[PDB]
Amino acid sequence: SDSIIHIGAIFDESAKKDDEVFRTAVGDLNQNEEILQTEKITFSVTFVDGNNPFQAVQEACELMNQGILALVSSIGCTSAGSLQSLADAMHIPHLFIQRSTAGTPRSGCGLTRSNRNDDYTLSVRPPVYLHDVILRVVTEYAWQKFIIFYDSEYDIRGIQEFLDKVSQQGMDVALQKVENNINKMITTLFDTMRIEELNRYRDTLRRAILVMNPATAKSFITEVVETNLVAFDCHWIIINEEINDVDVQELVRRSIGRLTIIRQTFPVPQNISQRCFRGNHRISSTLCDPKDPFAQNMEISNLYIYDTVLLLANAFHKKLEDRKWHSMASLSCIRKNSKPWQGGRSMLETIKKGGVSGLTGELEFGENGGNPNVHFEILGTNYGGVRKLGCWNPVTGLNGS
Amino acid sequence: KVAFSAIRSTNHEPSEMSNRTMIIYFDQVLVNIGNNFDSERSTFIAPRKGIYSFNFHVVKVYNRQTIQVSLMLNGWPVISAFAGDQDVTREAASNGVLIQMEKGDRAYLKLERGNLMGGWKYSTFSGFLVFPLGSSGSAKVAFSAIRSTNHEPSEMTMIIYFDQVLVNIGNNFDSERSTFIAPRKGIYSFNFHVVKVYNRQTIQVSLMLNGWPVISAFAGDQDVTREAASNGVLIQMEKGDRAYLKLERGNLMGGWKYSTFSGFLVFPLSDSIIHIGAIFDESAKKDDEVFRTAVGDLNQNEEILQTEKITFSVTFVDGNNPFQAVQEACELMNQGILALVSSIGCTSAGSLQSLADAMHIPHLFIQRSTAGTPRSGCGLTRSNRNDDYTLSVRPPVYLHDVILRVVTEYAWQKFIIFYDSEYDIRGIQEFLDKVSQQGMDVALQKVENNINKMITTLFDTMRIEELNRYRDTLRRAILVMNPATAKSFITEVVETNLVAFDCHWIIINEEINDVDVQELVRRSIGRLTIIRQTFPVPQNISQRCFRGNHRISSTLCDPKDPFAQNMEISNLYIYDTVLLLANAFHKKLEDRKWHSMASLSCIRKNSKPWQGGRSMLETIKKGGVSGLTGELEFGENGGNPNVHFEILGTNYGGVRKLGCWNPVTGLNGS
Ligand SMILES: [Ca+2]
Ligand SMILES: [Ca+2]
């Protein structure tokens, strides 16, 4: 058929959970009699190879031909720019949820905003503040010498500013990529390196920062511990937006010195019953029950996807309620003659000025089209068990020790 | 009044359907009186009983395979024609005949043998009603005879015999004597096609009018399997005048099967074969100039593409806009191209690479860096299960290997790396790993594009003890930046006494021209080492502007020329890329294995790839040319392996060559 409210979605082939949660969000909203009271949300989803930006563009174009009010994407940077540039050309509001590769910490995409042109892409996840946070924490601990370990997917441009600053303060900072198989890495090491090197190496590991996905960190921590490359006096920091409660418990278990864990956190209500509601809106218990295996295994992008669907629904609702609806249009991509959606500008403005309370806390956009809200918690344990040391956000800064 | 005329107006390859049905298609219809010709099916449906005339000319472009074209009447072949020469530019399968047709009878051309890879531009198919039957007029005279057998001649120097008579309205053609006797005064038309199977002898066939030759035709030259002596004419004949074919020269050993002889009473009394597309960043004006110069140079070269001119289409795009790149690339593919050349940054490379792979268009990618910043790898994901149509024309980025090797030679243990604001530090991630592994003390700093406020800020901001630490650190530095920023940066630090005579700085960038090098040395006051890419170019300044018989515009090869001295590296690669393609097309054409370009459609999940793409890609990929960069060629992984770096130095108190580096032999010299 053909509904009044139609949205498109492009997901990486790895984003099965994004798709499930996207559909759950639509489902939840359709049960909500207070939002879109006489209109059901319909959607079209396409999975693409996120390393294939033409396929992303191709499939996105097909959705626009069907006719959509907005495009939700959950993809890496490789295809983001193609989609962003398409969205701008077609005036289709584009809600972009950045996914990182293999749980590696995020680094900025560097999506070139449109100066003379209007930018139709909204960045749903907050800016990457990893470099700011890690610097602040390192400064608090008065470190002067330490090693930064990063996994094989991480984009070190994410810490270029960090490296500049530590150098400027005269610190001694080593860099090493950690191969995805730790066992052969460390075995190789002992064979390859001689004694005096390993002694130098051991000393260097007394203070380290891990910029990697928790799975690789787990294996890495264990292997160094078991091989006596660290000792009780060591202090390691792990930083990643995405480290779930199960990962945190396991990291602590595996470590034998002091460990500091820095991860993103989401303001979620007290009284476990009200966790699954936002006002009159009921959220599927599978997403909000933190005893649920799904909930404990959700990727961060999954939470943002829920709030994105939530945000759009409220945007459409307000537009409908105000009796200022502009219909979707069937667009054509590869036609240098083809025109943009005449409804796009007003829809974009409405979505852009929208705000909802969801699983991530507050989702909204600033004047620059990006979500400003983000919070980091800082966990610790000296061994001999984990507790909250402090919190960080980009406006108030560090709180606690 | 019934007549039709159709031509092939494009060089484009046959459709999937044409390959399956084998029916030769003609896209442009000049005449269609009565609309009895179905342009979609390329078939003529006879509207009434009568004698009809058909003529066809099927052109075989740079094809090695022999072809057989037959005129079909309701699924049965009437006349056939061959164009199986094995080393010829363009050859035609031509023949004609007069046949009787009933209402609803279907006439069309079928490709009984071979294929039309190279396309069949200029091929023609026309026909008309000579006169109807049943509807009466002594002005109805026509005959048509063919040789249906391979049998040797009957003790033939003599008259060419035709055993099978298809048409004989008026019974004026004596089949036994193969002679036409004009029944009345009028203008008569004659056409003949005599097929002479290579009997190691040339033949001359003449149309005779009362023992006198009117028109003549020749065959039997070359080693072509089946060749025809064809010609036609309109002549006035009187009653009892005799027209026939005589074999004036040679013999017909091997038979003359498929030979035709017909005649009747008239009344009684653009788009080129070689097209490439190009996508350039808006900043790439010099790439465009040099691209066009290369095409120009090749078109003057009589030894390459000797009978074919290269044409092209160029589009400029915002290289930070990958959709526009894809959009404009798609438009080029719709026009129809054999290859896509790009000169663009990494931002749009992946979109173009992925498009190329989808459409099977060979894609020759020339990486451009931003603002002369040193290159870092794009990280273009090669296709594993899929075939990768993108060829990387510039060599791999070896900056990290080279800088490490040089640093190792100087026994540095402590130094600072300076990089400009466009540089992608992933380029040195491996370098940083290794120096850390060897226990070195390495600082990193980005250099803002305005040095003056950077250093001024510094002195204000930093206190004494920091600046002393900072001064010490600058005694050994590496600059990973464009030369313009480096120039300004070197001067400002020198003038502000942040370095001294004992310092040693290294500058590394593929792209640093001779003017830049001289200026850097001038500005520096300690030891300076400059590492840049170099291109093996001949001695004797005269031979610099030639590669064999190929002449290069002096503006590119004269190193006193301002252009030459100002060329970006990408400019050189663009020249060699055009050069390489031309040789690839040449070899493919010469070998008579051409496959035509196709008009493709992008955003159509149904749309198919170019069927010619695989063979073209393989040919280009295995190509190699000598050009401005030295040798351009591709390895098994689809990338250019050739690269050379020179290492220049001066201790102050003037620059000289310290050594050379390449990735196979390694470092040479000190
Ligand atoms: Ca423990
Ligand atoms: Ca000097």
Side-chain angles (χ1 to χ4, degrees), chain B residues 469-480:
Chain B
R469 165 229 292 160
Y470 197 61
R471 282 173 163 161
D472 272 32
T473 294
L474 301 198
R475 289 191 293 225
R476 317 294 232 202
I478 306 181
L479 309 189
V480 183

Side-chain angles (χ1 to χ4, degrees), chain A residues 94-97 121-127 129 264 266-267 303-312 314-315 348-366 368-375 394-395:
Chain A
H94 171 214
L95 283 103
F96 171 49
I97 299 76
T121 301
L122 302 166
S123 292
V124 169
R125 286 180 83 164
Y129 280 109
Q264 182 182 8
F266 301 102
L303 293 63
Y304 283 104
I305 288 289
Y306 196 94
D307 294 359
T308 291
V309 178
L310 194 50
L311 190 147
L312 289 171
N314 277 283
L348 177 66
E349 281 316 303
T350 302
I351 296 164
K352 187 174 106 176
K353 72 171 202 262
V356 296
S357 301
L359 298 179
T360 63
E362 289 310 294
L363 172 57
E364 70 196 61
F365 305 106
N368 67 352
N371 180 356
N373 304 317
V374 65
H375 296 79
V395 314

Side-chain angles (χ1 to χ4, degrees), chain A residues 251-257 381 383-384:
Chain A
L251 291 165
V252 169
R253 281 187 147 258
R254 294 158 175 258
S255 50
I256 60 175
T381 181
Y383 179 106

Side-chain angles (χ1 to χ4, degrees), chain B residues 427-452 454-462 464 466-603 605-607 609-635 637-655:
Chain B
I428 51 171
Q429 88 184 27
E430 201 182 302
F431 176 53
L432 295 173
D433 271 28
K434 299 237 203 67
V435 304
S436 305
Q437 282 172 59
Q438 300 179 12
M440 312 185 187
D441 188 53
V442 175
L444 267 166
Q445 278 191 14
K446 177 166 82 71
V447 168
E448 315 131 28
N449 261 88
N450 171 251
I451 290 80
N452 191 305
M454 189 184 145
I455 287 166
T456 291
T457 301
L458 205 73
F459 278 89
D460 306 343
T461 311
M462 282 191 181
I464 311 312
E466 300 180 276
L467 258 60
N468 272 12
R469 165 229 292 160
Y470 197 61
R471 282 173 163 161
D472 272 32
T473 294
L474 301 198
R475 289 191 293 225
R476 317 294 232 202
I478 306 181
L479 309 189
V480 183
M481 54 190 76
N482 71 309
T485 300
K487 283 172 201 175
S488 290
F489 188 58
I490 291 162
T491 299
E492 190 70 25
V493 295
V494 158
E495 294 189 329
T496 56
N497 294 341
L498 294 168
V499 297
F501 62 94
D502 63 313
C503 75
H504 184 187
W505 279 24
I506 298 165
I507 304 181
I508 181 163
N509 193 326
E510 287 167 315
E511 183 151 305
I512 309 171
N513 62 28
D514 295 279
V515 175
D516 288 334
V517 174
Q518 286 172 14
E519 191 54 21
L520 291 165
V521 169
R522 281 187 147 258
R523 294 158 175 258
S524 50
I525 60 175
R527 192 177 182 171
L528 186 62
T529 305
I530 296 170
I531 301 167
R532 66 175 186 175
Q533 182 182 8
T534 194
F535 301 102
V537 159
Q539 170 177 338
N540 281 321
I541 187 165
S542 54
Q543 287 124 41
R544 294 179 92 91
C545 292
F546 295 82
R547 302 288 185 284
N549 292 306
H550 180 72
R551 157 167 270 187
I552 303 176
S553 284
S554 41
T555 64
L556 315 173
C557 46
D558 184 7
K560 291 318 304 176
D561 193 285
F563 193 97
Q565 298 175 331
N566 282 20
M567 285 170 82
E568 310 176 275
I569 283 169
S570 59
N571 308 164
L572 293 63
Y573 283 104
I574 288 289
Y575 196 94
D576 294 359
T577 291
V578 178
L579 194 50
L580 190 147
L581 289 171
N583 277 283
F585 301 154
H586 179 97
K587 182 179 158 52
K588 197 149 244 281
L589 284 160
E590 291 296 287
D591 291 349
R592 300 317 152 175
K593 291 178 177 150
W594 193 251
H595 196 137
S596 206
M597 76 233 80
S599 168
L600 309 176
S601 192
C602 279
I603 305 299
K605 291 149 98 280
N606 56 79
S607 78
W610 182 36
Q611 299 324 305
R614 195 53 174 164
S615 85
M616 184 60 74
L617 177 66
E618 281 316 303
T619 302
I620 296 164
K621 187 174 106 176
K622 72 171 202 262
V625 296
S626 301
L628 298 179
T629 63
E631 289 310 294
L632 172 57
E633 70 196 61
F634 305 106
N637 66 352
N640 180 356
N642 304 317
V643 65
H644 296 79
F645 282 86
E646 73 172 350
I647 301 153
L648 311 170
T650 181
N651 206 319
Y652 179 106
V655 59

